[PDB]
Protein backbone atom coordinates (compact mmCIF):
# COMPACT_ATOMS: atom_id res chain seq x y z
CA UNK A 1 0.00 0.00 0.00
CA UNK A 2 1.92 2.94 -1.45
CA UNK A 3 0.38 6.44 -1.77
CA UNK A 4 0.60 6.11 -5.63
CA UNK A 5 2.14 4.35 -8.71
CA UNK A 6 5.50 6.22 -8.41
CA UNK A 7 7.46 8.55 -6.08
CA UNK A 8 7.97 12.27 -6.93
CA UNK A 9 11.60 12.11 -5.58
CA UNK A 10 14.43 9.60 -4.85
CA UNK A 11 14.52 8.34 -1.23
CA UNK A 12 16.85 10.66 0.83
CA UNK A 13 15.73 10.48 4.52
Amino acid at each position, epitope marked *: *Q*APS*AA*P*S*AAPS*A
Partner: antibody
Framework: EVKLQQSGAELVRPGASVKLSCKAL????????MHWVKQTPVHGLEWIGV????????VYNQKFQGKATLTADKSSSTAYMEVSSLTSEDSAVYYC?????WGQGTTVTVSS | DVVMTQTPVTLSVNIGQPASISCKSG???????????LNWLLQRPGQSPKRLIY???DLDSGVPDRFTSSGSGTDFTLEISRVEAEDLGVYYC?????????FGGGTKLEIKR
Protein backbone atom coordinates in the same frame (compact mmCIF):
# COMPACT_ATOMS: atom_id res chain seq x y z
CA GLU B 1 -8.46 6.27 -0.38
CA VAL B 2 -4.94 7.91 -0.14
CA LYS B 3 -5.67 11.13 1.90
CA LEU B 4 -3.36 13.72 3.65
CA GLN B 5 -5.44 15.70 6.25
CA GLN B 6 -3.67 18.89 7.52
CA SER B 7 -4.60 21.06 10.59
CA GLY B 8 -6.63 24.31 10.14
CA ALA B 9 -5.60 27.98 9.70
CA GLU B 10 -3.44 29.74 12.33
CA LEU B 11 -2.78 33.32 13.45
CA VAL B 12 0.62 33.27 15.30
CA ARG B 13 2.66 36.12 16.94
CA PRO B 14 6.09 37.19 15.61
CA GLY B 15 8.87 35.33 17.54
CA ALA B 16 6.49 32.46 18.51
CA SER B 17 6.54 28.95 16.96
CA VAL B 18 3.70 26.84 15.42
CA LYS B 19 3.34 23.07 14.92
CA LEU B 20 1.30 21.84 11.93
CA SER B 21 -0.16 18.29 11.58
CA CYS B 22 -0.67 16.05 8.50
CA LYS B 23 -2.61 12.70 8.92
CA ALA B 24 -1.90 10.01 6.23
CA LEU B 25 -4.61 7.40 5.34
CA UNK B 26 -4.78 4.61 2.67
CA UNK B 27 -1.03 3.65 2.64
CA UNK B 28 1.75 2.36 5.02
CA UNK B 29 2.68 5.70 6.72
CA UNK B 30 5.97 4.34 8.18
CA UNK B 31 7.34 3.11 4.77
CA UNK B 32 7.24 6.30 2.57
CA UNK B 33 9.13 9.63 2.83
CA MET B 34 6.78 12.58 3.72
CA HIS B 35 7.69 16.03 2.28
CA TRP B 36 6.81 19.57 3.40
CA VAL B 37 6.52 22.57 1.06
CA LYS B 38 6.02 26.33 1.57
CA GLN B 39 3.91 28.34 -0.91
CA THR B 40 3.88 32.17 -1.25
CA PRO B 41 2.81 34.37 -4.17
CA VAL B 42 6.27 36.14 -4.01
CA HIS B 43 8.63 33.04 -3.82
CA GLY B 44 6.31 30.27 -5.26
CA LEU B 45 6.72 26.62 -4.11
CA GLU B 46 9.81 25.90 -1.93
CA TRP B 47 10.91 22.45 -0.59
CA ILE B 48 11.41 22.61 3.27
CA GLY B 49 12.43 18.95 4.06
CA VAL B 50 11.59 15.18 4.03
CA UNK B 51 11.04 12.73 6.98
CA UNK B 52 11.12 8.90 6.93
CA UNK B 53 8.36 8.37 9.56
CA UNK B 54 9.57 4.76 10.14
CA UNK B 55 13.22 5.65 10.99
CA UNK B 56 12.50 9.34 11.93
CA UNK B 57 15.47 10.47 9.73
CA UNK B 58 15.14 13.97 8.16
CA VAL B 59 16.87 15.96 5.35
CA TYR B 60 16.32 19.77 5.36
CA ASN B 61 16.79 22.41 2.70
CA GLN B 62 19.71 24.63 3.88
CA LYS B 63 17.27 27.64 3.64
CA PHE B 64 15.02 26.04 6.37
CA GLN B 65 17.65 24.47 8.76
CA GLY B 66 16.56 25.65 12.28
CA LYS B 67 13.37 27.48 11.03
CA ALA B 68 11.61 24.06 10.48
CA THR B 69 11.61 20.78 12.53
CA LEU B 70 9.91 17.64 11.04
CA THR B 71 8.44 15.05 13.53
CA ALA B 72 6.21 11.92 13.20
CA ASP B 73 3.94 9.79 15.43
CA LYS B 74 3.86 6.18 14.03
CA SER B 75 0.78 5.50 16.30
CA SER B 76 -1.65 8.10 14.75
CA SER B 77 -0.04 8.04 11.21
CA THR B 78 0.63 11.83 11.68
CA ALA B 79 3.57 13.95 10.36
CA TYR B 80 4.38 17.24 12.21
CA MET B 81 6.30 20.39 11.20
CA GLU B 82 7.18 23.01 13.88
CA VAL B 83 8.21 26.40 12.37
CA SER B 84 9.90 28.69 14.95
CA SER B 85 11.12 32.33 15.51
CA LEU B 86 8.29 33.42 13.16
CA THR B 87 8.81 36.57 11.00
CA SER B 88 6.64 38.25 8.31
CA GLU B 89 8.53 36.11 5.72
CA ASP B 90 6.92 32.98 7.33
CA SER B 91 3.21 33.81 6.48
CA ALA B 92 2.46 31.20 3.79
CA VAL B 93 0.45 28.12 2.87
CA TYR B 94 2.20 24.95 4.17
CA TYR B 95 1.63 21.55 2.43
CA CYS B 96 2.62 17.97 3.26
CA UNK B 97 2.93 15.75 0.14
CA UNK B 98 4.41 12.41 -1.07
CA UNK B 99 4.25 10.34 -4.32
CA UNK B 100 2.20 13.14 -6.04
CA UNK B 101 -0.47 13.22 -3.28
CA TRP B 102 -0.80 16.61 -1.41
CA GLY B 103 -2.64 17.76 1.73
CA GLN B 104 -5.20 20.61 1.43
CA GLY B 105 -2.65 22.98 3.09
CA THR B 106 -2.63 25.20 6.22
CA THR B 107 -2.58 29.03 5.97
CA VAL B 108 -0.26 30.57 8.61
CA THR B 109 -0.44 34.34 9.18
CA VAL B 110 2.34 35.95 11.33
CA SER B 111 0.85 39.06 13.03
CA SER B 112 0.52 40.58 16.57
CA ASP C 1 19.48 24.62 -5.77
CA VAL C 2 19.03 23.19 -9.33
CA VAL C 3 17.26 26.18 -11.05
CA MET C 4 13.96 25.10 -12.75
CA THR C 5 12.91 27.50 -15.58
CA GLN C 6 9.47 27.21 -17.26
CA THR C 7 8.30 28.93 -20.47
CA PRO C 8 6.16 30.67 -21.26
CA VAL C 9 5.18 32.43 -17.97
CA THR C 10 1.55 32.68 -19.29
CA LEU C 11 -0.05 30.60 -22.13
CA SER C 12 -3.35 31.92 -23.66
CA VAL C 13 -5.11 29.17 -25.67
CA ASN C 14 -8.47 28.67 -27.46
CA ILE C 15 -10.40 25.52 -26.40
CA GLY C 16 -9.52 22.61 -28.78
CA GLN C 17 -6.12 24.15 -29.75
CA PRO C 18 -2.80 22.55 -28.68
CA ALA C 19 -0.66 23.80 -25.74
CA SER C 20 3.03 23.08 -24.95
CA ILE C 21 4.93 24.17 -21.77
CA SER C 22 8.80 23.89 -21.56
CA CYS C 23 10.75 23.03 -18.35
CA LYS C 24 14.64 23.19 -18.27
CA SER C 25 16.87 22.31 -15.21
CA GLY C 26 20.35 23.78 -14.35
CA UNK C 27 21.84 20.23 -14.59
CA UNK C 28 20.66 16.65 -15.47
CA UNK C 29 17.78 15.02 -13.46
CA UNK C 30 18.94 11.46 -14.41
CA UNK C 31 19.41 10.01 -10.85
CA UNK C 32 22.27 7.48 -10.17
CA UNK C 33 19.39 4.93 -9.47
CA UNK C 34 18.35 5.23 -13.19
CA UNK C 35 14.99 7.07 -12.55
CA UNK C 36 14.57 10.75 -13.72
CA UNK C 37 12.40 12.39 -10.97
CA LEU C 38 10.85 15.23 -13.12
CA ASN C 39 7.15 15.89 -12.18
CA TRP C 40 4.29 18.10 -13.49
CA LEU C 41 1.75 19.70 -11.10
CA LEU C 42 -1.51 21.57 -11.82
CA GLN C 43 -2.85 24.04 -9.23
CA ARG C 44 -6.05 26.16 -9.23
CA PRO C 45 -6.44 29.26 -7.02
CA GLY C 46 -7.18 28.33 -3.36
CA GLN C 47 -6.58 24.56 -3.94
CA SER C 48 -3.73 22.01 -3.47
CA PRO C 49 -1.51 21.17 -6.44
CA LYS C 50 -2.36 17.94 -8.38
CA ARG C 51 0.41 15.70 -9.81
CA LEU C 52 -0.34 15.02 -13.54
CA ILE C 53 3.02 13.44 -14.68
CA TYR C 54 5.80 11.48 -12.82
CA UNK C 55 9.20 10.08 -13.91
CA UNK C 56 9.21 12.50 -16.94
CA UNK C 57 6.59 10.90 -19.26
CA ASP C 58 4.14 8.85 -17.06
CA LEU C 59 0.50 10.11 -16.65
CA ASP C 60 -0.86 9.81 -13.06
CA SER C 61 -4.34 8.23 -12.52
CA GLY C 62 -7.48 10.06 -13.83
CA VAL C 63 -5.33 12.26 -16.16
CA PRO C 64 -6.83 12.36 -19.70
CA ASP C 65 -4.79 10.94 -22.67
CA ARG C 66 -4.71 14.51 -24.22
CA PHE C 67 -1.80 15.18 -21.73
CA THR C 68 1.70 14.01 -22.89
CA SER C 69 5.24 14.85 -21.61
CA SER C 70 8.84 13.85 -22.55
CA GLY C 71 12.45 15.12 -22.32
CA SER C 72 15.56 13.90 -20.41
CA GLY C 73 18.82 15.45 -19.06
CA THR C 74 18.07 19.22 -18.70
CA ASP C 75 15.21 20.05 -21.20
CA PHE C 76 11.54 18.87 -20.68
CA THR C 77 8.05 19.42 -22.24
CA LEU C 78 4.33 19.07 -21.31
CA GLU C 79 1.92 18.98 -24.32
CA ILE C 80 -1.92 19.15 -24.44
CA SER C 81 -3.25 17.81 -27.81
CA ARG C 82 -6.56 19.81 -27.60
CA VAL C 83 -7.01 22.12 -24.50
CA GLU C 84 -10.33 21.70 -22.57
CA ALA C 85 -11.95 24.40 -20.31
CA GLU C 86 -11.01 22.46 -17.10
CA ASP C 87 -7.26 22.34 -18.08
CA LEU C 88 -6.73 25.96 -16.88
CA GLY C 89 -4.53 26.83 -13.87
CA VAL C 90 -0.79 27.01 -13.09
CA TYR C 91 1.39 24.10 -14.32
CA TYR C 92 4.54 23.54 -12.18
CA CYS C 93 7.52 21.32 -13.06
CA UNK C 94 9.64 20.11 -10.15
CA UNK C 95 12.70 17.82 -9.67
CA UNK C 96 13.10 15.19 -6.88
CA UNK C 97 16.54 14.02 -8.22
CA UNK C 98 18.78 16.61 -6.40
CA UNK C 99 18.73 18.04 -2.81
CA UNK C 100 17.23 20.44 -2.06
CA UNK C 101 14.19 19.61 -4.29
CA UNK C 102 13.28 22.67 -6.44
CA PHE C 103 10.13 23.82 -8.36
CA GLY C 104 9.76 25.82 -11.60
CA GLY C 105 8.07 29.29 -11.38
CA GLY C 106 4.86 28.00 -13.05
CA THR C 107 3.16 28.51 -16.43
CA LYS C 108 -0.43 29.86 -16.09
CA LEU C 109 -2.77 28.34 -18.74
CA GLU C 110 -5.56 30.86 -19.53
CA ILE C 111 -8.53 30.04 -21.83
CA LYS C 112 -9.49 32.36 -24.73
CA ARG C 113 -13.24 32.45 -25.59
Amino acid sequence: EVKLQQSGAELVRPGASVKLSCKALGYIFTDYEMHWVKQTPVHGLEWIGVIHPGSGNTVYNQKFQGKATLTADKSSSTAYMEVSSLTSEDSAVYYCNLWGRWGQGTTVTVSS
Amino acid sequence: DVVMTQTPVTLSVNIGQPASISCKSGQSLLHSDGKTYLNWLLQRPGQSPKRLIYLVSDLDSGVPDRFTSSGSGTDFTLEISRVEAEDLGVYYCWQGTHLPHTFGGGTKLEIKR
